Amino acid sequence: CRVPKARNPTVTYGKNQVIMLLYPDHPTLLSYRNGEEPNYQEEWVMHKKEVVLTVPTEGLEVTWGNNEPYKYWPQL
Amino acid sequence: YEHVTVIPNTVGVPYKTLVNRPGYSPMVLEMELLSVTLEPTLSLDYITCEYKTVIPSPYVKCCGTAECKDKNLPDYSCKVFTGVYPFMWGGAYCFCDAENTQLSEAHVEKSESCKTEFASAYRAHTASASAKLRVLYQGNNITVTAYANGDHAVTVKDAKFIVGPMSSAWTPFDNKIVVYKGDVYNMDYPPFGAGRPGQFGDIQSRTPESKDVYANTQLVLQRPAAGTVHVPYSQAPSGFKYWLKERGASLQHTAPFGCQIATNPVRAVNCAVGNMPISIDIPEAAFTRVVDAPSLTDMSCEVPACTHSSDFGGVAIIKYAASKKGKCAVHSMTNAVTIREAEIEVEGNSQLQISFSTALASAEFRVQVCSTQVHCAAECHPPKDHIVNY
Numbered sequence: 268c269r270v271p272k273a274r275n276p277t278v279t280y281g282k283n284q285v286i287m288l289l290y291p292d293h294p295t296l297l298s299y300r301n302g303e304e305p306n307y308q309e310e311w312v313m314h315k316k317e318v319v320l321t322v323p324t325e326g327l328e329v330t331w332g333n334n335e336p337y338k339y340w341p342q343l
Numbered sequence: 344y345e346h347v348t349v350i351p352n353t354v355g356v357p358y359k360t361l362v363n364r365p366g367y368s369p370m371v372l373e374m375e376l377l378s379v380t381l382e383p384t385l386s387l388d389y390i391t392c393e394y395k396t397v398i399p400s401p402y403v404k405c406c407g408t409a410e411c412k413d414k415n416l417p418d419y420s421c422k423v424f425t426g427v428y429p430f431m432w433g434g435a436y437c438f439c440d441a442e443n444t445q446l447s448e449a450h451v452e453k454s455e456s457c458k459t460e461f462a463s464a465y466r467a468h469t470a471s472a473s474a475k476l477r478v479l480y481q482g483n484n485i486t487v488t489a490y491a492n493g494d495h496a497v498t499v500k501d502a503k504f505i506v507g508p509m510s511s512a513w514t515p516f517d518n519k520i521v522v523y524k525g526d527v528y529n530m531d532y533p534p535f536g537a538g539r540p541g542q543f544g545d546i547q548s549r550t551p552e553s554k555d556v557y558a559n560t561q562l563v564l565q566r567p568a569a570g571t572v573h574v575p576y577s578q579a580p581s582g583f584k585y586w587l588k589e590r591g592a593s594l595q596h597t598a599p600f601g602c603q604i605a606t607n608p609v610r611a612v613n614c615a616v617g618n619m620p621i622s623i624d625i626p627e628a629a630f631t632r633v634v635d636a637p638s639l640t641d642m643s644c645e646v647p648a649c650t651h652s653s654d655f656g657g658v659a660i661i662k663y664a665a666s667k668k669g670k671c672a673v674h675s676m677t678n679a680v681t682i683r684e685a686e687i688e689v690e691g692n693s694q695l696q697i698s699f700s701t702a703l704a705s706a707e708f709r710v711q712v713c714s715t716q717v718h719c720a721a722e723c724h725p726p727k728d729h730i731v732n733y
Contacts, residue, residue, distance in 0.1 A: 280728055280729045280730040281729055282729050283729070284730070285730055298592065298596065300596050301599065302599040302600050302601075302615070303599030303600065304599055305598055305599055307591070307592040307597040309592065325599065325600060325601065325615070326601050328601065337732065338601075338732055338733060339730050339731075340653070340730065340731050340732070340733060341729065341730055342652055342653060342726045342730065342731055343652060343702040
């Protein structure tokens with residue numbers, strides 16, 4: 268089955284955290300996971316929403332719609 | 344000469360190892376675990392898929408009483424209803440007004456979809472660790488593919504490699520696992536013959552080719568409507584269809600240490616669990632004697648630029664006075680800092696430039712160029728981006 272993709276959100280960084288300004292044109296699935304404790308969380312983004320995600324030392328993987336997953340790591 | 348070292352089980356991280364053979368010039372080897380695969384041994388317990396409520400034409404016994412026989416079928420249900428008077432388009436189906444019975448029959452077998460749409464219940468035990476270690480050997484990159492058991496010698500360019508045994512026998516996998524297409528799930532699945540209705544395992548088949556299947560689906564046959572030929576029933580909907588929407592995120596998304604999960608065969612790729620011992624039997628020809636190697640004297644070190652980060656944010660200029668021309672190994676004698684280059688071409692009364700990585704704001708480190716050490720003083724500043732994407 269063929270599918271499409273969304274646009275890359277405007278990304279801003281902070282101390283052990285990532286801030287994304289999501290601008291969806293249609294309902295888009297936003298999923299993320301951490302290490303030993305992945306703590307999987309998912310939400311369908313309908314309109315303009317700012318998301319604040321904590322980036323642990325082990326790393327954070329974020330999937331925004333049909334796009335390839337984004338990987339984030341904190342600076343030593 | 345056998346060089347024994349231990350690196351953490353982390354893919355995409357180059358590690359520097361100092362080989363010091365007595366009476367021979369030091370050797371710096373860069374090792375990187377291209378890809379780390381943790382393949383557990385699988386034992387198939389059963390297959391699950393969507394069931395098929397098989398309801399044949401009801402046996403309407405006109406002027407008589409039908410009899411239910413105990414059939415060895417999954418979720419077999421039989422009920423004989425009395426005082427039935429059914430109608431078809433051209434009037435009543437039975438000659439008698441009273442004494443007509445309807446025998447309703449139903450059972451739950453594998454659907455036609457079971458060969459295409461199915462989940463497999465596996466018993467996962469003792470994961471076999473494998474990893475191809477890119478080695479910067481004699482200024483060239485060599486690839487070594489070996490079983491991480493500590494009993495598999497792989498020889499590349501006359502250097503014998505013994506990888507493992509793995510410090511951790513685990514793998515983003517529990518004792519009981521469930522596989523659906525390209526997704527793996529950690530699930531304490533019910534054993535064969537213990538599956539509940541409307542849940543994962545409502546229908547259980549030992550193999551996808553199996554003839555006799557287990558079935559437990561709350562199938563209850565109801566009395567048909569007045570003058571109506573049909574088989575009304577109350578049931579529990581497909582457990583496999585229910586699991587498909589209730590499964591949640593797979594191990595590829597939930598596993599710690601950034602594990603990547605693949606299928607055919609099921610494996611944990613690029614995870615971070617435990618470490619990996621490495622044994623390298625380096626041949627005599629690869630080594631150069633201390634007398635045959637250049638002698639380092641009148642050394643000084645200056646750091647014109649430094650940023651303490653995960654990557655090589657530090658720059659160091661080392662001035663030297665070499666006895667002859669030749670190759671010299673570069674290695675940090677301080678575990679707090681790591682140098683990017685393993686080998687440099689030495690000339691005479693010249694200088695060399697190195698790239699280093701550190702987390703310390705005040706970096707005090709010793710650099711060993713060939714067989715002589717030089718002290719480096721660095722004042723490293725904080726990075727600009729708190730978060731990096733590698």
